[PDB]
Amino acid sequence: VVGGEDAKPGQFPWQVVLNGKVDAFCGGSIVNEKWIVTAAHCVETGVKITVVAGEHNIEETEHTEQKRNVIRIIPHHNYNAAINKYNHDIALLELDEPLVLNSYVTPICIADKEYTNIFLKFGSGYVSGWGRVFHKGRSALVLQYLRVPLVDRATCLRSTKFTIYNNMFCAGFHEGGRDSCQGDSGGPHVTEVEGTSFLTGIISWGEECAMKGKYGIYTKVSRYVNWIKEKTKLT
């Protein structure tokens, strides 16, 4: 997150970071004790993914941390990195042992397909992660967050020469300087509804970071609410 601010511990309980070939290479969100939501392109075959919940300073030991191993990956069935790697960019991760919920480890709310889309329309969303704090720079030791206004569908489609499918959306600023960046994707884009946050998107991709004229593409979670609710439901 470029142009962001330091989150206070426990401010985004649902936030998790993914570690594999590289530490904090992607973010995620807690659906429940056993499931994480993230981007499909964050899961490259072979790499063993490690999930840490209750994370704040990626370098130190706050004692709120919780490590878990992934025993299953379920990328959305329409996802196909061969044709395109950012279309249907959403995946599920089953943890080996259930997380213990507390003030630092809390799931995000997933609403109806219809409300999810209404809350997205409120205009403002919160984005957070331990990604680059400057285009092509260092990552964040401490979790960063940033509020991003929704961008006009017409504007969004005109900002890139790449195809923006109705499965994705734009958010960010016309000015630039403030955007999400690499290392953040897989992370949440939440909307707060009277003190209760709901997942309204997933940090996916972009072109450079915080550069004026270009935005960040996020996965429109509303088109996936059901698939999530289905495969994450506990038994």
């Binding site: 206070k8 401010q11 309980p13 507390n102 630092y104 809390t106 209760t196």
Partner: protein, 57 residues
């Protein structure tokens, strides 16, 4: 009441199923109090909420 009128006064979700009646509902980890519109936590830590002091004071 039209469930479209101010969400039917439902804190979270509103509907109309049988006799097109404005029914309210909450999300997992919440249950509808007798106030019949507001949602109340039905778990120690429901979803989407902050429960750690943002201040030391």
């Amino acid at each position: 009441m039209t469930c479209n009128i101010k969400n039917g006064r439902c804190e979270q979700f509103c509907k109309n199923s049988a006799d097109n009646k404005v029914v309210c509902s909450c999300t997992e980890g919440y249950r509808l109090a007798e106030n019949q519109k507001s949602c109340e936590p039905a778990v120690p830590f429901p979803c989407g909420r902050v429960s750690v002091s943002q201040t030391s004071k």
